[PDB]
Ligand binder design. Structure first.
Ligand SMILES: [Zn+2]
Ligand SMILES: [Zn+2]
Ligand SMILES: [Zn+2]
Ligand SMILES: [Zn+2]
Lengths: 149, 64, 64, 149
């Protein structure tokens, strides 16, 4: 290569040794820059059970720019839009080359477990979430039923 | 500390550059004082990748 | 590089202070640039023990 | 301890793992600061065969001061006096805490293999050595015979 290349090869090669808890990812074709992750809906979120698939796309000048990550799977979460885009700090402003694809998946997981108050990507969902979890989680698990599993 | 391998995988991993993650770390940041990247990765960075403290210089390390 | 142990004995030995040879190295010398002693041993030295270059300062390293 | 203490303990503990080629040393009593080395006259010096014993004494503020080392054994060498003292750069001006007892023994060995022109401790011996090795080595081995073995 490289350099993103020789880097991403380690990334991948490490994600094999020590995969992040809930999921796995990898190259789709021989194009090492186009990845697909599968994330296994985390227990004690309202997404447990269902399985979710995400698309990873490394920029040519990764790790200095953050990778493009977005759910292909349908999902009910205030920080994920109807088109798949994720609303996460590291994915945008807070990204650092120091942090790995492995590490981002994790934070996505934890984001599914704990959505946000200031960030609402979909204001439709956020409001229901704010002080009516009861309702929120029903629709959350309902979608998990319908589209995830 | 658990037997056969590691630290070793881990020990080297603590000592390898944090961005190319290939070359061994060689550069202390000014002023943040992190010894966390190799000579080559440095120029492409404005802020130290660890604490988002902005880099203003480098000291090179000679483990001779 | 030969099997079981080492580098490990040796890897740690490359990373340990050069005078107390107990505590891990933490200090880059100014100006000689050697990262070769731990915080504690430094004060007792006028010249860097490696190249007899005289010490005029220190930078502290944060492997955080 | 320590600190010289905890240091010297490693010194010793390492000199066991990886002893310097020709010799070994260690504490005499429980006084870790009083050591005795035995050095095994190096092959292809005129001292081969014979065995030599040295006395090591660590200063209380070692490693910042060099250890006191001197042959108890008799020896014919321009850089060692009739009383046992060694004339070596590191033993005096060139000492550095960075260097170990192990390392000094080595340089003593190599000093026995290659004496000096500017340093003559015993000018009596140096002159014979200068341009009459023939003669020098005879007396050198002769003493090895008489006192070393
Ligand atoms: Zn690098
Ligand atoms: Zn920093
Ligand atoms: Zn030290
Ligand atoms: Zn130096």
């Amino acid at each position: 290569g490289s350099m993103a290349l020789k880097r991403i090869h380690k990334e991948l090669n490490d994600l094999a040794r020590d995969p992040p808890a809930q999921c796995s990812a990898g190259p789709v074709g021989d194009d090492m820059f186009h990845w697909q992750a599968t994330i296994m809906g985390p227990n004690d979120s309202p997404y447990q059970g269902g399985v979710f698939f995400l698309t990873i796309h490394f920029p040519t000048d990764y790790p200095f720019k953050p990778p493009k990550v977005a759910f292909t799977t349908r999902i009910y979460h205030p920080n994920i839009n109807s088109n798949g885009s994720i609303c996460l700090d590291i994915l945008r402003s807070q990204w650092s080359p120091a942090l790995t694809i492995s590490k981002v998946l994790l934070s996505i997981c934890s984001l599914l477990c704990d959505p946000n108050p200031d960030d609402p990507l979909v204001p439709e969902i956020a409001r229901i979430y704010k002080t009516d979890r009861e309702k929120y989680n029903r629709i959350a698990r309902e979608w998990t039923q319908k589209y995830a599993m | 500390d658990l037997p056969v391998e590691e630290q070793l995988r881990r020990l080297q991993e603590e000592r390898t550059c944090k961005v190319c993650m290939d070359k061994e770390v060689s550069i202390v940041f000014i002023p943040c004082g992190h010894l966390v990247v190799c000579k080559d990765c440095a120029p492409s960075l404005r802020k130290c990748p660890i604490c988002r403290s902005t880099i203003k210089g480098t000291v090179r390390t000679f483990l001779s």
